[PDB]
Amino acid sequence: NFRVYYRDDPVWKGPAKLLEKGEGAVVIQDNSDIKVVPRRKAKIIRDYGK
Amino acid sequence: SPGIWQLDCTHLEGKVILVAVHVASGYIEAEVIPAETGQETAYFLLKLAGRWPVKTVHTDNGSNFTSTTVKAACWWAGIKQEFGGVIESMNKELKKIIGQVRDQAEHLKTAVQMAVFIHNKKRGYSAGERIVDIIATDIQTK
Amino acid sequence: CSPGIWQLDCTHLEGKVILVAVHVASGYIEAEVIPAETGQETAYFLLKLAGRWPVKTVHTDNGSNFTSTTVKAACWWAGIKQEFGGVIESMNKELKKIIGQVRDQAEHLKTAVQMAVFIHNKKRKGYSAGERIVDIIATDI
Amino acid sequence: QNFRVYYRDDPVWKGPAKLLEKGEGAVVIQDNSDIKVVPRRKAKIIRDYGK
Ligand SMILES: Cc1ccc(C2CC2)c(-c2ccc3c(c2)CCCO3)c1[C@H](OC(C)(C)C)C(=O)O
Ligand SMILES: Cc1ccc(C2CC2)c(-c2ccc3c(c2)CCCO3)c1[C@H](OC(C)(C)C)C(=O)O
Ligand SMILES: [Cl-]
Ligand SMILES: [Mg+2]
Ligand SMILES: [Mg+2]
């Protein structure tokens, strides 16, 4: 699955649930709150190593 | 277990040495990192995970080891983190070898890697031979 | 071939220097982004590599960093024989290909480099390169 | 146990040179066909530790 880390405050928050990866913004959910974050403030990470 | 590592930082000459030990063998890798931060720790872990089958890393509660960038690296690479004496014993041993060889190199980091080599190659098996044997056995027997 | 034989070469992306080492018999690789393509950076890379693996021979082209005095010193101290003059060049291309596949997942080029190293070393044909180097070296003990 | 000497004159390092003699303040070395006296601080005497 995916986890999204994101910024607002320079500390990276998350993991949040990924909902949509847009060109300029990312839609996520973090603790039941829906958030829209700019692409540059989001880090979308897979569990590649399982 | 073949997949268990301990990581910790130690200091010499105002510089930060990040040390990884393969607990079952005593094998070590180390880097002088420019700052004792989560970002530098996370990059080190990604390199380590590409070389060996890193399944669990044990650390103390230093803020670099509990940082979000390290959690991200561990999630990507499939590493489980556990928190809270092998590496602390290993810190002292490495500093001892470093002090024995320090005047042979200009840079502290050169002495650090000389000491790592010396530690890993010393024999009737060395730590470098033991980690390769432990991991290959796990593979060769499913 | 010999379990002790490695090839090293530099490649370049985004204006940065990537130093790559390949264990010829397994395909296993290690890489680092170095700040300058110098003998001193190459020598330091070799000291680290020699501490991890039984490095007996390193094969390179005649790039001035590989023929430098500092690298000679490192190889002398570590017990490494140097030979000069297509495995690593094939590996450079494959590494650059994986980097491109994952590049937008990391801010820093060096982060994507290490992700690509991990991907290459862990992929099974049916052993992975990371399994073959450990299998080859343990058997040769 | 074998030794080679690397040294400066020019900030580029030279060598390997054969170690002829080590004194308290200088090393005497032979780089190809020239014998040189080099201050200790400008020389690195390196053993083939890996062996
Ligand atoms: C800074 C420097 C300059 C010159 C040398 C060699 C004389 C040729 C070495 C060197 C090169 C290799 C070497 C040792 C020393 C000592 C024994 C182990 O192998 C180093 C070295 O710095 C690096 C970054 C490694 C180049 C250092 O810190 O003195
Ligand atoms: C610069 C930066 C910031 C934040 C992160 C994480 C969101 C918390 C990562 C990161 C951390 C771990 C990680 C990946 C990315 C991508 C997948 C592999 O694991 C990186 C990262 O820089 C390093 C130097 C590695 C910290 C980068 O260049 O984006
Ligand atoms: Cl003298
Ligand atoms: Mg600590
Ligand atoms: Mg080249």
Domain CATH code at residue A20: 2.30.30.10
Q: Are A14 and A4 in contact (CB under 8 A)?
A: yes
Question: Which residue is associated with the tokens 């590989």?
Answer: C66
The partner residues of C22 in beta bridges, in order of sequence, read: C7, C29
Residue D16, C-beta contacts closer than 8 angstroms, at least 6 positions apart: C72, C73, C76, D4, D5, D6, D46
Q: Are C116 and C32 in contact (CB under 8 A)?
A: no
Q: Dig out the tokens for B137 from the structure.
A: 């056995």
Experiment used for this model: X-ray
C78: chain B residues, CB-CB within 8 Å: 117
Q: Are A15 and B75 in contact (CB under 8 A)?
A: yes
Q: Are B97 and B115 in contact (CB under 8 A)?
A: yes
Pocket of ligand 2 (CB under 6 A): A 5, 12, 43, 45; B 39, 42-43, 46, 68-69, 72-73, 76; C 105-108, 111, 115
Q: How far is CA C68 from CA B63, C40, C75, C84, D43, in A?
A: 40, 8, 11, 12, 17
Q: How many whole angstroms separate alpha carbon D17 and alpha carbon D3?
A: 9
CATH number at residue B71: 3.30.420.10
Three-state SS for B30-48 is EEEECCCCHHHHHHHHHHH
Stretch 1-51 of chain D: residues touching chain B, C-beta under 8 Å: 44, 46, 49-50
SS3 state of residue D38: strand
- Stated resolution in angstroms: 1.8
Tally of structural domains, chain D = 1
Q: Dig out the tokens for C104 from the structure.
A: 């937008």
What element of type H or E holds D29?
strand D26-31
Listing from the earlier edge strand, what are the strands of the sheet with D14-22? D34-39, D26-31, D14-22, D3-7, D43-47
Q: How many whole angstroms separate alpha carbon C15 and alpha carbon B22?
A: 35
Range of the domain at D43: 3-47
Please provide the distance, in angstroms rounded to a whole number, between the alpha carbons at the two ends of chain A: 9
SS3 state of residue B75: helix
Residue A6, C-beta contacts closer than 8 angstroms, at least 6 positions apart: A12, A13, A14, A16, A26, A28, A30, A35, A37, A41, A42, A43
What element of type H or E holds C118?
helix C109-122
Amino acid at C117: V
Does the distance separating the beta carbons of A49 and C118 come in below 8 Å? yes
Q: How many whole angstroms separate alpha carbon C94 and alpha carbon D7?
A: 40
CB-CB: which of B49, B68, B75 is closest to A47?
A: B75
Strands A33-38 and A25-30: antiparallel
- Count CA atoms closer than 13 A to C9's CA, side-chain side: 21
The partner residues of D5 in beta bridges, in order of sequence, read: D17, D45
Q: How many whole angstroms separate alpha carbon C126 and alpha carbon B92?
A: 41
Strands B27-33 and C5-13: unpaired
Q: Are C73 and C83 in contact (CB under 8 A)?
A: no
Q: What is the DSSP string of C51-108?
A: HHS---EEEE---TTTSSHHHHHHHHHHT-EEEE--HHHHHHHHHHHHHHHHGGG-SS
Q: Dig out the tokens for C110 from the structure.
A: 């060096």
Closest residue, chain C, to D14 (C-alpha): C69
